[PDB]
């Protein structure tokens, strides 16, 4: 049945149907338009009228323009054909390579897996990064979350994990460009064609791309997170494959909701956010999980507004994660990369049963001496290092060497850094830090530990400094 | 020995005051940023409260 546009304010559009009123979540095709504009039904205002959210720009909409009802939500293509193809929020191909032909279509909205369908097996995932694997190691078929402020190093960290894990892994992958740079979408596309994970001629691609970037309106950025999510659900449920989902950035989902909630006619919550913040995120995040049949290992970049982790959007995400990676600016500005906070980042698999007692005791040992070093900062500020006790000098000396050894040259960072990237295994990392805690490298300088792979290269770098005098 | 320690305590305490002055300057900025935000946030509570009546 046909419907008439009664009101239009920004992204929100109101549609009045005479009879056959569409339910919530259903997509509505706006007629008399050049590109395919889509209106998802949000509310029922009453008097045979419904409030909607526009997936594209609302410019050019006249009051009384005809709107059709599909009788279902925003349906998108899903299959092996979606691999190596770029999609947008409403499923259309945005890579100029014809239509994505598939034998089945999936709706962007769906209920989360039930309690009976949840899995229990949490195996460790070896990243290669020193600060990660020791303190807050990731899990295979889990939910990884990379927190960070403006320009700390999230996109570098996510592209490192795509370079390391997603390349050398027998299974499919998904990337979701939710409200970030379209330039980064261009770089990622051509880098993956250059590598081989995406193939233009052959139909043997690992990565499936979905993009609704910061140039798009709020309606797109609100729903494009779900579009990329639905692609991973096909590979999990119907096939039963190990999937790797990469959302950059997850905050933009919540930010998009904050923009529309004003226009949707709600009373604002704390810090001007929507009242439906936890629940809207909850229905979205719970779909991203490891079921009994398939498996998803989601690595989500998380933006932190104004470097405030107490902000509602990054605060609520913490509960949804298995492993955290809190990137600090204070660590980045000192020169330490990746700027992962060792007294903030945590993981659930950090347990004597899972990783081992040698892993656990060394992990907490690094965290102990860093905590002791941080506590004495007020005393060093006013009085100085001389006024400290002789035993505390040894405590401070090692902590700074431990801080510098936690740093690591990256593979993706070679283009601008110059130095070659490193990939330290699990056994070599724990062995290296345990020697520093016990005090086997007290005679060596601090700058030797700065930017190295394993402990062996740190000692080799010190001898190079000795030759220069 | 007595002349060496008094010269050192002078310069040490001079550094202690100057290092404290830097901490005061930066904490004054963080104070004023937080001061304004508390006024802004608590005002928004009252405006949101009046709107819902």
């Amino acid at each position: 049945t046909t419907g008439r546009i009664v009101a239009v304010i920004g992204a929100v559009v109101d549609v009045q149907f005479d009879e056959g009123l569409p339910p919530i979540l259903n997509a509505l095709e706006v007629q008399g338009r050049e590109t395919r504009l889509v209106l998802e039904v949000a509310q029922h205002l009453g008097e045979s009228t419904v409030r909607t959210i526009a997936m594209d720009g609302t410019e050019g909409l006249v009051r009384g323009q005809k709107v059709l009802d599909s009788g279902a939500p925003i349906r998108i293509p899903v299959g092996p054909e979606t691999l190596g193809r770029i999609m947008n929020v409403i499923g259309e191909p945005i890579d100029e390579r014809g239509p994505i032909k598939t034998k089945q279509f999936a709706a962007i909205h769906a209920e989360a897996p039930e309690f009976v369908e949840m899995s229990v097996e949490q195996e460790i995932l070896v990243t290669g990064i020193k600060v990660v694997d020791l303190l807050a190691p990731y899990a295979k078929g889990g939910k990884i979350g990379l927190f960070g402020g403006a320009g700390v190093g999230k996109t570098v960290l996510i592209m490192e994990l795509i370079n390391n894990v997603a390349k050398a892994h027998g299974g499919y992958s998904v990337f979701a460009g939710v409200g970030e740079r379209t330039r980064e979408g261009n770089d990622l596309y051509h880098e993956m064609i250059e590598s081989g994970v995406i193939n233009l001629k052959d139909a043997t691609s690992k990565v499936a791309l979905v993009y609704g970037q910061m140039n798009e309106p709020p309606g797109a950025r609100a729903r494009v997170a779900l579009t990329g999510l639905t692609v991973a659900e096909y590979f999990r449920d119907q096939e039963g494959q190990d999937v790797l989902l990469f959302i950059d950035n997850i905050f933009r989902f919540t930010q998009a909701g904050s923009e529309v909630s004003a226009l949707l006619g709600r009373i604002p919550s704390a810090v001007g956010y929507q009242p439906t913040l936890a629940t809207d995120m909850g229905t979205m995040q719970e779909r991203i999980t490891t079921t009994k049949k398939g498996s998803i290992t989601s690595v989500q970049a998380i933006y932190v507004p104004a470097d405030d982790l107490t902000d509602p959007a990054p605060a609520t995400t913490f509960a949804h994660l298995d492993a955290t990676t809190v990137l600090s600016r204070a660590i980045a500005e000192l020169g330490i990369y990746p700027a992962v906070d060792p007294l903030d980042s945590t993981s659930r698999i950090m347990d004597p049963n899972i990783v081992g007692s040698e892993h656990y005791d060394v992990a907490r040992g690094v965290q102990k001496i860093l905590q002791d070093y941080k506590s004495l900062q007020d005393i060093i500020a006013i009085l100085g290092m001389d006024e400290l006790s002789e035993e505390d000098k040894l405590t401070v000396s090692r902590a700074r060497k431990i801080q510098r050894f936690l740093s690591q040259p990256f593979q993706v960072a070679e283009v601008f850094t110059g130095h070659l990237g490193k990939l330290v295994p699990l056994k070599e990392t724990i062995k290296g830090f345990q020697q520093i805690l016990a005090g086997e490298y007290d005679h060596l300088p601090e700058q030797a530990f700065y930017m190295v792979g394993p402990i062996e290269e740190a000692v080799a770098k010190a001898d190079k400094l000795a030759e220069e005098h | 020995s007595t002349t060496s320690e008094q010269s050192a305590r002078m310069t040490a305490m001079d550094n202690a005051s100057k290092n404290a002055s830097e901490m005061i300057d930066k904490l004054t900025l963080t104070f004023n940023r937080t001061r304004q935000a508390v006024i802004t946030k608590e005002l928004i509570e009252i405006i949101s409260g009046a709107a819902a009546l």
């Binding site: 290092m385 000795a466 | 830097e22």
Partner: peptide, 28 residues
């Protein structure tokens, strides 16, 4: 503080020279 770093980095830059001075002698 800004000069909190000034005192601490001055201490360890001196101790870096002392430790490298001990390292070069053992290298011979």
């Amino acid at each position: 503080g800004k000069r909190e770093q000034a005192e601490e980095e001055r201490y360890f830059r001196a101790r870096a020279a002392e430790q490298l001075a001990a390292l070069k002698k053992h290298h011979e």
